[PDB]
Amino acid sequence: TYEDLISHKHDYPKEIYKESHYIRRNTRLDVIKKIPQFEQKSKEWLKQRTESLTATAISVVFDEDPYKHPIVILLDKCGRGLPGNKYEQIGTMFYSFRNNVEVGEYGLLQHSGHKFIAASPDGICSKKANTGGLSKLVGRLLEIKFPFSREINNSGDLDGDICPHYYFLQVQTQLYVTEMDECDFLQCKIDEYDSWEDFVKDSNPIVPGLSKTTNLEKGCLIQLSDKNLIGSDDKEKCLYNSKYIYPPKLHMTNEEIAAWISSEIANYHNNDLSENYMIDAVIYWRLSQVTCNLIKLNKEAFEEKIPLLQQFWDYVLFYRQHSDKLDKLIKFVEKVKEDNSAEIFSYINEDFLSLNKDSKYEPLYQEETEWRKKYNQIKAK
């Protein structure tokens, strides 16, 4: 009854892609694989992070983010201030399984034309179906969120209600960078079992790979603890700074689970992360609620907003080379609060125009965006 969970709705019936969009998406993905990924925390990876605005920052720069204001993005890219998730891959394996397509993760990708706009999608579906043949999901991005207190809505506007707007802008920027058309917005709630006993207790009788209370997959997770830190540290720095070893596939039998845990222990002497991280605990998880919503790219609507992003990045490049004016800017934001974007960026645009006498740039955020007004309205009460 396990094979009944593999949906074949996206299996492509032909050997070669006939429709044009499938061909272009596959070709673009093949171009993406040719783009070199880089090792973490070293090499050009710094020259990739500092040279662009990540997709999660674009919602803030648009003045359409409900928690951060543009000045924090401006100061972050200049190294100043004021004073992912651990289950993501599990979601990837769920989507790859139930939709019968191979999903690959790729590092940070910068847009070809506007290099200062970059994004890192949680995964892109390849052309290969799992049960053989091609798949219709080729080139479809994956964006997976794990809210803890927020309730997942399935009705209402796609831009506002089903998908939170800042996440919607993140997906739009991701689709713009990778030059793809579709992205699946997957929202998952995960509970962890107290013990292995409770894990085997909640097993669905007819199907061992599911939970009997949520009718969704369950599995294991290996936690690798940082060494420098932790050892005897005392807070939540340890949680964020853990890395994880993930199971090979879902719907594992209990024996295969324990055998894989042990083999992972023995071979961790050769695991690179275990040499730099210590095997901590073994977590047992189950999916409790999974929603998926297709999001398509509006390219013209984003290109209309590219000029604003260009002006913002020009401000970043400006204050990166003038440390004195950056200090006096920090004092100016110290005076009037950081949510007052109109005055802050009027000051910033003056500072910019003072040394660039041929810039037609006008101050940004002079009027609240419609989303800013909506958020402030939601604040009352």
User: How far, in Å, are 122, 184, 379 from residue 150 at the CA level?
Assistant: 21, 19, 16
Q: Interacting stretch for Mg ion, rule CB under 5 A, among 51-59, 280-288, 292-300, 327-335?
A: 51-59
Residues across the chain: 381
One residue of 55, 61, 175, 297 binding Mg ion per CB under 5 A: 55
Minimum separation from the CB atom of position 357 to a second copy (A): 24
Helix (H, G, I), strand (E, B) or coil at 296: strand
For a second copy, the binding residues (CB under 8 A) are 46, 66-67, 79-84, 145-150, 164, 227-239, 323-324, 326-327, 330, 378-379
Mutual angle of helices 341-355 and 323-335, in 10-degree steps: 160
- What, of a second copy, Mg ion, none, does residue 120 touch, CB below 5 to 8 Å by kind? Mg ion
Judged by beta carbon distances under 5 to 8 A according to partner kind, the member of a second copy, Mg ion, none in contact with residue 107 is none
**Residue 369 touching Mg ion (CB under 5 A):** no
Contact between 220 and 282 (Cβ < 8 Å): yes
CA distances, 155 to each of 147, 162, 163, 279, 368 (Å): 17, 6, 10, 43, 27
Count interface residues toward Mg ion (CB under 5 A). Answer: 5
Residue number, nearest CB to Mg ion: 55
- 11: which strand partners? 135
- Smallest distance from the beta carbon of 194 to Mg ion, in angstroms? 29
Element (H, E) at 293: strand 277-296
The DSSP call for residue 158 is I
List the single partner that 248 binds among Mg ion, a second copy, none, CB under 5 to 8 Å by kind: none
Residue from 247, 147, 143 nearest 188 by CA: 147
Which one-letter amino acid corresponds to residue 331? K
**Cβ contacts of 245-250, under 8 Å, gap ≥ 24:** 245/271, 245/273, 246/89, 246/90, 246/93, 246/221, 246/222, 247/93, 247/219, 247/220, 247/221, 249/93, 249/97, 250/93, 250/94, 250/97, 250/209, 250/217, 250/219
Residue 291 Cβ vs a second copy, minimum distance, rounded to whole Å = 14
Q: Which is nearer to Mg ion, 11 or 179 (CB)?
A: 179
Residue 307 interaction partner, one of a second copy, Mg ion, none, beta carbon < 5-8 Å per kind:
none
The one among 11, 63, 65, 122 contacting Mg ion by CB under 5 A = 122
- By a kind-dependent CB cut-off of 5 to 8 A, residue 1 interacts, out of a second copy, Mg ion, none, with none
Q: Tell me whether residue 35 or residue 82 sits nearer to a second copy (CB atom).
A: 82
- Rg (C-alpha) for the chain, rounded Å, is 23
Strands (E) in 146-276, as ranges, are 182-192, 218-226, 243-245
Is 110 among the residues that bind Mg ion (CB under 5 A)?
A: no
State the binding partner of 378 from Mg ion, a second copy, none, CB within 5 to 8 A by kind.
Answer: a second copy
CB 308 within 8 Å of CB 61: yes
Q: Does 120 bind Mg ion (CB under 5 A)?
A: yes
Angstrom distance (rounded) from CA 234 to CA 232? 7
Q: Which does 234 bind (CB under 5 to 8 A by kind): Mg ion, a second copy, none?
A: a second copy
Q: Which is nearer to a second copy, 146 or 260 (CB)?
A: 146
Work out how close the CB of 232 gets to a second copy at its nearest, in angstroms, rounded to a whole number: 4
Q: Which does 229 bind (CB under 5 to 8 A by kind): Mg ion, a second copy, none?
A: a second copy
Residue among 11 and 65 whose Cβ is closer to Mg ion: 65
Q: CB nearer to a second copy: give 73 or 250.
A: 73
- Pick one of 54, 204, 310, 346: the residue that binds Mg ion (CB under 5 A): 54
How far apart are the C-alpha atoms of 321 and 79, rounded to whole Å?
12
Binding partner selected for residue 230 from a second copy, Mg ion, none, CB under the kind-specific 5 to 8 Å limit: a second copy
Complex with a second copy: residue 81 or 307, whichever CB lies closer: 81
Residues that bind Mg ion (CB under 5 A): 54-56, 120, 122
